[PDB]
Amino acid sequence: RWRQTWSGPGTTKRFPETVLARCVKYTEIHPEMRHVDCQSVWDAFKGAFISKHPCDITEEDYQPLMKLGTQTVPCNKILLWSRIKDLAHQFTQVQRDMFTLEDTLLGYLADDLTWCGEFATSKINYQSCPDWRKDCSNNPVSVFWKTVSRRFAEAACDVVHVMLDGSRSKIFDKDSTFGSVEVHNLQPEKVQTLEAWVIHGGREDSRDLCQDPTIKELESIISKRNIQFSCKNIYRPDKFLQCVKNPEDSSC
């Protein structure tokens, strides 16, 4: 209609079918999750937000889902990212040099989807869903991501990489999920170093963005956790990707 209860997009069309089909597909590829019952996954997922006011969702609502989707990826090969989705995923698709959150089952099930329910009825809302800004932050989508990204950062160890969008004006941004959750969930007992790869946009001959003020801030923030900091410009993202796929032939 012309009004809409909430200001964000409604649940993605086909959401139940999509999530079940992703679970089936993921548990076909990944032998360590080949024990998972996909219908039980869907039910645990749907139970977190059906018949619940979509501005009252808690991390508890998602605990049965997080249990069924329990998974360990190698803790020393984690790739976090911020505002540079495409290249982080492309990079991990190549030879599985690292794992992002969206290469875990739970991140895989939800990537790029929206969903909410209603306090009123047991139906899925396919017309609109709370916006984190205009409506409430404790909505099904934002809660889910906050919870699974905390857990994924908490699991990381050794050297943890992060890819940042060097086009952004705030290359490290305290308001992003990386700056507000993941970075404050790297464990000081386990993480030796965080290494940022700052991805350069197009043409420029370009500044050394590892000296950017927000990078120096990130550096001094993670030093209180007793984590070392390293930073690398990626000047040419498509030649980066090229070298990643053609390991050897080291023109570089």
Side-chain angles (χ1 to χ4, degrees), residues 1-94 96-202 206-235 237-245 247 252:
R1 330 192 262 60
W2 59 85
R3 243 227 65 236
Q4 286 328 350
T5 307
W6 302 120
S7 301
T11 295
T12 303
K13 289 288 269 42
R14 293 178 45 69
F15 175 76
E17 314 96 294
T18 299
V19 172
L20 192 65
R22 288 180 176 190
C23 189
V24 176
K25 180 170 198 247
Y26 189 100
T27 49
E28 286 169 335
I29 300 180
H30 290 95
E32 77 266 27
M33 305 295 284
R34 77 189 132 137
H35 67 281
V36 166
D37 175 274
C38 284
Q39 180 72 217
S40 293
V41 172
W42 166 236
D43 291 338
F45 202 145
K46 178 178 71 127
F49 69 92
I50 283 297
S51 308
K52 299 178 157 159
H53 190 282
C55 288
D56 192 37
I57 306 289
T58 57
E59 152 158 4
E60 285 94 341
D61 292 315
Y62 280 115
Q63 272 301 354
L65 176 65
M66 328 242 55
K67 283 205 194 352
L68 297 178
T70 295
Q71 174 163 201
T72 329
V73 307
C75 69
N76 65 312
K77 297 171 186 295
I78 286 186
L79 178 67
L80 298 183
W81 55 278
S82 198
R83 275 90 196 251
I84 191 87
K85 173 132 140 212
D86 239 282
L87 204 219
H89 292 329
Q90 278 182 83
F91 167 74
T92 57
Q93 298 278 112
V94 166
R96 337 242 84 179
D97 331 48
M98 300 168 196
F99 299 75
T100 56
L101 173 61
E102 300 79 20
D103 294 309
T104 73
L105 169 64
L106 284 167
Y108 185 97
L109 294 181
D111 195 15
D112 292 314
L113 299 187
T114 298
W115 64 84
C116 57
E118 346 188 326
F119 180 51
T121 191
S122 60
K123 265 184 292 205
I124 285 180
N125 195 338
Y126 299 91
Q127 270 311 111
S128 68
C129 281
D131 184 63
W132 152 288
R133 295 185 57 202
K134 316 108 193 265
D135 304 306
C136 49
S137 49
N138 302 332
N139 60 264
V141 174
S142 308
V143 167
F144 167 86
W145 287 116
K146 172 180 233 282
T147 305
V148 299
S149 81
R150 190 182 80 234
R151 287 169 100 270
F152 190 67
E154 282 170 345
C157 74
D158 301 337
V159 178
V160 175
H161 295 80
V162 56
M163 232 185 244
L164 312 168
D165 181 0
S167 298
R168 267 331 183 79
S169 99
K170 308 217 220 156
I171 302 172
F172 171 60
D173 182 348
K174 80 201 196 48
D175 288 337
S176 64
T177 290
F178 181 64
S180 72
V181 2
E182 294 177 337
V183 85
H184 287 111
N185 289 277
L186 298 172
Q187 302 297 287
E189 310 85 330
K190 278 119 70 67
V191 177
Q192 142 77 351
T193 296
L194 168 83
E195 166 163 299
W197 296 347
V198 177
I199 309 305
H200 280 61
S206 260
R207 298 146 49 223
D208 164 15
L209 294 167
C210 287
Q211 295 288 296
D212 186 84
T214 64
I215 297 300
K216 310 280 82 180
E217 182 218 284
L218 202 218
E219 182 174 43
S220 75
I221 285 190
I222 71 152
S223 308
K224 216 230 159 222
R225 283 192 171 258
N226 224 285
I227 299 172
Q228 285 172 208
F229 183 72
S230 155
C231 179
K232 237 181 82 198
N233 281 280
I234 302 185
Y235 279 110
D238 54 51
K239 147 160 110 143
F240 174 67
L241 256 200
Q242 197 49 208
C243 278
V244 169
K245 341 207 178 167
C252 297

Short mmCIF file of all heavy atoms in Angstrom, two decimals, residues 13-35:
data_model
loop_
_atom_site.label_atom_id
_atom_site.label_comp_id
_atom_site.label_asym_id
_atom_site.label_seq_id
_atom_site.Cartn_x
_atom_site.Cartn_y
_atom_site.Cartn_z
N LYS A 13 11.53 -11.69 -0.77
CA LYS A 13 10.58 -12.69 -1.30
C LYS A 13 11.18 -14.08 -1.20
O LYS A 13 12.42 -14.24 -1.31
CB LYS A 13 10.25 -12.38 -2.76
CG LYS A 13 9.35 -11.12 -2.90
CD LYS A 13 7.85 -11.31 -2.42
CE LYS A 13 6.89 -11.79 -3.58
NZ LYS A 13 7.45 -12.89 -4.53
N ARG A 14 10.38 -15.08 -0.86
CA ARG A 14 10.86 -16.44 -0.83
C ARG A 14 11.82 -16.77 0.32
O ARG A 14 12.49 -17.81 0.33
CB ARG A 14 11.40 -16.87 -2.21
CG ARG A 14 10.32 -16.98 -3.26
CD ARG A 14 10.81 -17.37 -4.71
NE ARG A 14 11.76 -18.46 -4.68
CZ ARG A 14 11.48 -19.72 -4.37
NH1 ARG A 14 10.25 -20.10 -4.04
NH2 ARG A 14 12.46 -20.60 -4.35
N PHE A 15 11.78 -15.95 1.38
CA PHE A 15 12.78 -16.11 2.44
C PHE A 15 12.86 -17.53 3.04
O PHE A 15 13.95 -18.09 3.09
CB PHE A 15 12.55 -14.98 3.55
CG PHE A 15 13.42 -15.11 4.71
CD1 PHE A 15 14.76 -14.73 4.64
CD2 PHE A 15 12.95 -15.60 5.87
CE1 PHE A 15 15.64 -14.76 5.82
CE2 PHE A 15 13.82 -15.71 7.04
CZ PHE A 15 15.19 -15.30 6.99
N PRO A 16 11.72 -18.14 3.46
CA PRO A 16 11.75 -19.54 4.00
C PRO A 16 12.41 -20.54 3.00
O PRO A 16 13.32 -21.31 3.40
CB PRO A 16 10.25 -19.91 4.18
CG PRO A 16 9.63 -18.46 4.47
CD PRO A 16 10.36 -17.56 3.44
N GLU A 17 11.93 -20.53 1.75
CA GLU A 17 12.51 -21.39 0.71
C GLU A 17 14.03 -21.13 0.54
O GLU A 17 14.83 -22.06 0.42
CB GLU A 17 11.68 -21.32 -0.59
CG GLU A 17 10.15 -21.45 -0.28
CD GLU A 17 9.31 -20.10 -0.15
OE1 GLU A 17 9.49 -19.27 0.74
OE2 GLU A 17 8.34 -19.86 -0.93
N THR A 18 14.42 -19.87 0.46
CA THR A 18 15.82 -19.54 0.32
C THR A 18 16.68 -19.99 1.41
O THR A 18 17.79 -20.46 1.14
CB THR A 18 15.93 -18.07 0.17
OG1 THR A 18 15.21 -17.74 -0.99
CG2 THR A 18 17.44 -17.60 -0.22
N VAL A 19 16.25 -19.77 2.66
CA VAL A 19 17.13 -20.16 3.78
C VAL A 19 17.21 -21.68 3.83
O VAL A 19 18.26 -22.26 4.12
CB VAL A 19 16.57 -19.60 5.13
CG1 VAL A 19 17.31 -20.13 6.23
CG2 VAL A 19 16.64 -18.06 5.13
N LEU A 20 16.13 -22.37 3.58
CA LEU A 20 16.24 -23.83 3.66
C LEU A 20 17.19 -24.38 2.54
O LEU A 20 18.05 -25.21 2.81
CB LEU A 20 14.83 -24.46 3.57
CG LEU A 20 14.80 -25.94 3.93
CD1 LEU A 20 15.19 -26.08 5.40
CD2 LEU A 20 13.36 -26.56 3.68
N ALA A 21 17.10 -23.81 1.34
CA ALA A 21 17.90 -24.20 0.19
C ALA A 21 19.35 -23.87 0.36
O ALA A 21 20.25 -24.60 -0.13
CB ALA A 21 17.35 -23.52 -1.10
N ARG A 22 19.64 -22.73 1.01
CA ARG A 22 21.05 -22.46 1.41
C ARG A 22 21.57 -23.43 2.42
O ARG A 22 22.75 -23.85 2.35
CB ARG A 22 21.15 -21.09 2.04
CG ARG A 22 21.00 -20.07 0.99
CD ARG A 22 21.09 -18.68 1.57
NE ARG A 22 21.03 -17.65 0.54
CZ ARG A 22 21.27 -16.33 0.72
NH1 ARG A 22 21.62 -15.84 1.88
NH2 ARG A 22 21.19 -15.51 -0.31
N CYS A 23 20.75 -23.79 3.39
CA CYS A 23 21.28 -24.76 4.38
C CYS A 23 21.63 -26.12 3.74
O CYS A 23 22.75 -26.69 3.90
CB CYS A 23 20.24 -24.94 5.49
SG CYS A 23 20.77 -25.87 6.89
N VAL A 24 20.65 -26.68 3.06
CA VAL A 24 20.92 -27.87 2.24
C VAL A 24 22.20 -27.76 1.38
O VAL A 24 23.11 -28.61 1.51
CB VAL A 24 19.69 -28.29 1.47
CG1 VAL A 24 20.03 -29.52 0.52
CG2 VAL A 24 18.63 -28.67 2.47
N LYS A 25 22.35 -26.69 0.59
CA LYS A 25 23.50 -26.54 -0.25
C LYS A 25 24.82 -26.46 0.57
O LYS A 25 25.79 -27.13 0.21
CB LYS A 25 23.38 -25.35 -1.22
CG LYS A 25 24.59 -25.25 -2.05
CD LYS A 25 24.57 -24.30 -3.20
CE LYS A 25 25.73 -24.69 -4.18
NZ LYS A 25 26.86 -23.62 -4.25
N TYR A 26 24.82 -25.71 1.68
CA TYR A 26 26.02 -25.49 2.47
C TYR A 26 26.44 -26.73 3.13
O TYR A 26 27.64 -26.99 3.20
CB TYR A 26 25.82 -24.39 3.55
CG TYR A 26 27.09 -23.97 4.27
CD1 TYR A 26 27.76 -22.80 3.90
CD2 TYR A 26 27.61 -24.71 5.33
CE1 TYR A 26 28.95 -22.40 4.59
CE2 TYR A 26 28.78 -24.33 6.01
CZ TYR A 26 29.42 -23.21 5.67
OH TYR A 26 30.56 -22.98 6.40
N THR A 27 25.47 -27.50 3.64
CA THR A 27 25.77 -28.72 4.34
C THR A 27 26.12 -29.82 3.36
O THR A 27 26.57 -30.86 3.79
CB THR A 27 24.64 -29.19 5.21
OG1 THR A 27 23.40 -29.18 4.46
CG2 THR A 27 24.39 -28.19 6.33
N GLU A 28 25.93 -29.60 2.06
CA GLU A 28 26.40 -30.54 1.02
C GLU A 28 27.86 -30.32 0.72
O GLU A 28 28.58 -31.28 0.58
CB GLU A 28 25.57 -30.47 -0.30
CG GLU A 28 24.20 -31.14 -0.12
CD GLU A 28 23.17 -30.93 -1.25
OE1 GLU A 28 23.28 -29.91 -1.98
OE2 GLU A 28 22.22 -31.78 -1.40
N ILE A 29 28.27 -29.07 0.57
CA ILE A 29 29.65 -28.71 0.39
C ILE A 29 30.61 -28.94 1.59
O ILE A 29 31.73 -29.34 1.42
CB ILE A 29 29.68 -27.17 0.08
CG1 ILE A 29 28.89 -26.90 -1.17
CG2 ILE A 29 31.16 -26.60 -0.14
CD1 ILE A 29 28.86 -25.53 -1.52
N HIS A 30 30.20 -28.60 2.78
CA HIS A 30 31.09 -28.56 3.92
C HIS A 30 30.96 -29.78 4.82
O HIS A 30 29.97 -29.91 5.56
CB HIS A 30 30.76 -27.28 4.70
CG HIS A 30 31.17 -26.04 3.97
ND1 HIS A 30 30.30 -25.32 3.17
CD2 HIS A 30 32.38 -25.45 3.81
CE1 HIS A 30 30.95 -24.32 2.60
NE2 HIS A 30 32.20 -24.36 3.00
N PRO A 31 31.93 -30.70 4.74
CA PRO A 31 31.75 -32.00 5.37
C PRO A 31 31.55 -31.94 6.93
O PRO A 31 30.91 -32.83 7.53
CB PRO A 31 33.06 -32.74 4.99
CG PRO A 31 34.01 -31.66 4.79
CD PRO A 31 33.23 -30.63 4.04
N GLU A 32 32.12 -30.92 7.56
CA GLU A 32 32.03 -30.78 9.00
C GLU A 32 30.63 -30.37 9.47
O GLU A 32 30.27 -30.56 10.64
CB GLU A 32 33.07 -29.79 9.49
CG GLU A 32 32.67 -28.34 9.23
CD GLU A 32 33.19 -27.74 7.93
OE1 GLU A 32 33.45 -28.47 6.91
OE2 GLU A 32 33.32 -26.48 7.96
N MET A 33 29.83 -29.80 8.56
CA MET A 33 28.44 -29.44 8.86
C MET A 33 27.46 -30.41 8.17
O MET A 33 26.26 -30.18 8.13
CB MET A 33 28.17 -28.02 8.41
CG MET A 33 29.14 -27.00 9.01
SD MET A 33 28.96 -26.88 10.79
CE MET A 33 27.42 -25.90 10.93
N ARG A 34 27.97 -31.52 7.65
CA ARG A 34 27.07 -32.44 6.97
C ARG A 34 26.12 -33.20 7.97
O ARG A 34 25.27 -33.94 7.55
CB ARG A 34 27.87 -33.36 5.98
CG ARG A 34 28.58 -34.44 6.72
CD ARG A 34 29.56 -35.26 5.89
NE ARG A 34 30.77 -35.32 6.67
CZ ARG A 34 31.52 -36.36 6.84
NH1 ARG A 34 31.23 -37.51 6.25
NH2 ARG A 34 32.58 -36.22 7.61
N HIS A 35 26.26 -32.95 9.27
CA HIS A 35 25.41 -33.51 10.35
C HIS A 35 24.14 -32.66 10.67
O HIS A 35 23.30 -33.05 11.50
CB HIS A 35 26.22 -33.62 11.66
CG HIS A 35 26.62 -32.29 12.24
ND1 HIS A 35 27.68 -31.55 11.75
CD2 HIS A 35 26.06 -31.52 13.23
CE1 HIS A 35 27.75 -30.39 12.40
NE2 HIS A 35 26.78 -30.35 13.31
#
